[PDB]
Symmetry: C2
């Protein structure tokens, strides 16, 4: 599967993963900027720590930057 | 944790779950309406079938209707 991977901006091939993921969380700047976001690919929908939020898909290239940083 | 649960519109208490989840997928009407969405609470971030997309959080009430139906 091909997912967008942070920090790169072009879609990467990931032969061993099955989902595309977006992870968003807030810093002191949440309101003025938006959520911080980390884009990747995984074998499985990854585990969240309290306060971080995750989005998982399994369509090629389905993890582009969210806008607000979740939506 | 308290999550929004479909079809109800008021936040429900879920003593045994740890995440709030949003699941979205498309039907023939995707473009004119938006994604179909199912809201719930879980012990863990649930497993996706190809083409369905999932969002998981662990803050009280963090799973309200998405708008577009993912964003």
């Amino acid at each position: 599967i091909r997912c967008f991977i942070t920090p790169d901006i072009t879609s990467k091939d990931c032969p061993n993963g099955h989902v595309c993921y977006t992870k968003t969380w807030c810093d002191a700047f949440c309101s003025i900027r938006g959520k911080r976001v980390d884009l990747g690919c995984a074998a499985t929908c990854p585990t969240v720590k309290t306060g971080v939020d995750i989005q998982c898909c399994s369509t090629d290239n389905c993890n582009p930057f969210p806008t607000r940083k979740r939506p």
